[PDB]
Write an enzyme that holds these catalytic residues in place. Structure first.
Site, PDB file in Angstrom:
ATOM      1  N   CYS A  34     -37.578 -49.101   3.162  1.00 27.28           N
ATOM      2  CA  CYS A  34     -37.638 -48.778   1.743  1.00 27.28           C
ATOM      3  C   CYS A  34     -38.186 -47.364   1.568  1.00 27.28           C
ATOM      4  O   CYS A  34     -39.320 -47.084   1.961  1.00 27.28           O
ATOM      5  CB  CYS A  34     -38.505 -49.821   1.036  1.00 27.28           C
ATOM      6  N   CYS A  37     -41.149 -46.959  -0.807  1.00 28.76           N
ATOM      7  CA  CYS A  37     -42.353 -47.552  -0.220  1.00 28.76           C
ATOM      8  C   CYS A  37     -43.003 -46.593   0.776  1.00 28.76           C
ATOM      9  O   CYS A  37     -44.227 -46.424   0.786  1.00 28.76           O
ATOM     10  CB  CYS A  37     -42.026 -48.866   0.497  1.00 28.76           C
TER      11      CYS A  37
END
Ligand SMILES: [Mg+2]
Ligand SMILES: [Mg+2]
Length: 214
Positions: A34, A37
């Site tokens: 991600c 993230c």
């Protein structure tokens, strides 16, 4: 020390590490692939250090631990949930700047901006028990703690349905917040005619504006 301050969660450890933890816990639902993230990962490291003693940061990888996030309605990642004493205090979806994160945390770890002069007594009486002496009785009893400005016997319908329950909130406004505090400490959790009373501060600005809904 020179060590990792983030708690690494699993599905099995989530209950004790997050729900039963002491103090605020910021949980990051994330995954290795991600992008955003990864982009907030060093921000969270700095937050974990700068808010030490005031906040714990924890991470749950949703690929390796797929059970927990759907129980919170997580959709996209990263998603941040702020927990305190087992309650979800705030949520934030998606990446954000360190400045935005610090405002999100400061505004939700803050508490109240002012100790109120207004006490609310909940679960004290049912509407059938209200009579014309109740307001005067509350006034004389709460005079033991300080000067009572006003008492409101408020009945609130708990829903739109016809048969919705009606509960009673008793508002006691004192002259200054020190008096309100003595009354709350002395009365909160006490039993009154078979009922356990909740006595707590009530937002003063709401009360001053005839908003008794909280
Ligand atoms: Mg989400
Ligand atoms: Mg989402």
């Amino acid at each position: 020390p020179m060590s990792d301050k983030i708690i690494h969660l699993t599905d099995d450890s989530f209950d004790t590490d997050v729900l039963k933890a002491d103090g605020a816990i910021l949980v990051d639902f994330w995954a290795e692939w991600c992008g955003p993230c990864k982009m907030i990962a060093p921000i969270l490291d700095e937050i974990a250090d700068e808010y030490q003693g005031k906040l714990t940061v924890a991470k749950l990888n949703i690929d390796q631990n797929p059970g927990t996030a759907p129980k919170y309605g997580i959709r996209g990642i990263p998603t941040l949930l702020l927990f305190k004493n087992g309650e979800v205090a705030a949520t934030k979806v998606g990446a954000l700047s360190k400045g935005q994160l610090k405002e999100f945390l400061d505004a939700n770890l803050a508490g109240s901006a002012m100790e109120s002069t207004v006490m609310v007594l909940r679960n004290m009486v049912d509407p059938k028990d209200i009579d014309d002496d109740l307001e005067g009785e509350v006034t004389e009893e709460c005079g033991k703690f300080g000067a009572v400005n006003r008492v409101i016997i408020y009945q609130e319908k708990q829903g739109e349905e016809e048969d919705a329950e009606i509960i009673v909130k008793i508002f006691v406004e004192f002259s200054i917040a020190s008096e309100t505090h003595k009354a709350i400490q002395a009365l909160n959790g006490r039993w009154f005619a078979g009922r356990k009373v909740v006595a707590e501060v009530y937002d003063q600005e709401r009360f001053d504006n005839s908003d008794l809904s909280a």
